[PDB]
Amino acid sequence: EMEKEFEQIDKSGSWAAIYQDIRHEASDFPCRVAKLPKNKNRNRYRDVSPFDHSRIKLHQEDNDYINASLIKMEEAQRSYILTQGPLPNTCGHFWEMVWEQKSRGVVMLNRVMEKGSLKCAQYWPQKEEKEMIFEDTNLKLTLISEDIKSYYTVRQLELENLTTQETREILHFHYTTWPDFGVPESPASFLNFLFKVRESGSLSPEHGPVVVHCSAGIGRSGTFCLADTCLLLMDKRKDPSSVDIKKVLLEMRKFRMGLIQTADQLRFSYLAVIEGAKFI
């Protein structure tokens, strides 16, 4: 298994080296649209910019820009949209994207406040009776139910396109225990959370791609997708030992920057895949 590789990297303390190597080999593509003056206020400071070739376009004539990328994993037959935590002025854009992309699930891998600082806008309603209206994109969002568990919360939301009165159910999967510094000691809670997302149907082909976000510039989202894709490929290939997390990561990195932002995150991703594969 990659477990053999894992222990060998651990032994030589070569996480930094391996991570730097991946960093160096990773794709570099233009983000010209992201860099336009008119979009300055649509980008979260210290977050990555989306590549032009894989950016998600809002269906609007005047400004189609959102900081979001489509990661399309051909062999695994999974797609994910990775995006930044919504800003005060982009929550309407965010939910417009969810509507337009026919997503069923949103996966949030950070708390609204971390390290005493705000990491994203409060972009969903916190009480059933106090819905949100995003006037710029003409959408209404209602909290339908909320189940708080020790390591994550799941919410049912209702998203209404106010133009057509069509309504959809969106599931919000909120992982609430990622530590302020470093990575989780054990991948167990993170894997359980991934399994809860899968069990919901939010990652499945009958729906648009899941929308995943965390904090600015510090990964997490990439770990979630990388883990999910590696595990799927192990189940599908004739030779599961052939699945190389480093190769899967480099393929995903063709679609967005800043998946895996530290050696520790790389290590944690291997740990989640090893433990998850044992479970599956």
UniProtKB/Swiss-Prot annotation:
Its main location: endoplasmic reticulum. It catalyses: O-phospho-L-tyrosyl-[protein] + H2O = L-tyrosyl-[protein] + phosphate. GO terms for molecular function: cadherin binding; enzyme binding; ephrin receptor binding; insulin receptor binding; non-membrane spanning protein tyrosine phosphatase activity; protein kinase binding; protein phosphatase 2A binding; protein tyrosine phosphatase activity. Residues 2-276 form the Tyrosine-protein phosphatase domain. Its EC number is 3.1.3.48. This is Tyrosine-protein phosphatase non-receptor type 1. Changing S49 to A/D: No phosphorylation. The lineage of its organism: Eukaryota, Metazoa, Chordata, Craniata, Vertebrata. It is a peripheral membrane protein. Tyrosine-protein phosphatase which acts as a regulator of endoplasmic reticulum unfolded protein response. Mediates dephosphorylation of EIF2AK3/PERK; inactivating the protein kinase activity of EIF2AK3/PERK. May play an important role in CKII- and p60c-src-induced signal transduction cascades. May regulate the EFNA5-EPHA3 signaling pathway which modulates cell reorganization and cell-cell repulsion. May also regulate the hepatocyte growth factor receptor signaling pathway through dephosphorylation of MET. The chain holds residues 2 to 281 of 435 of the full protein. Oxidized on Cys-214; the Cys-SOH formed in response to redox signaling reacts with the alpha-amido of the following residue to form a sulfenamide cross-link, triggering a conformational change that inhibits substrate binding and activity. The active site can be restored by reduction. Ser-49 is the major site of phosphorylation as compared to Ser-241 and Ser-242. Activated by phosphorylation at Ser-49. Interacts with EPHA3 (phosphorylated); dephosphorylates EPHA3 and may regulate its trafficking and function. Interacts with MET. Interacts with NCK1.
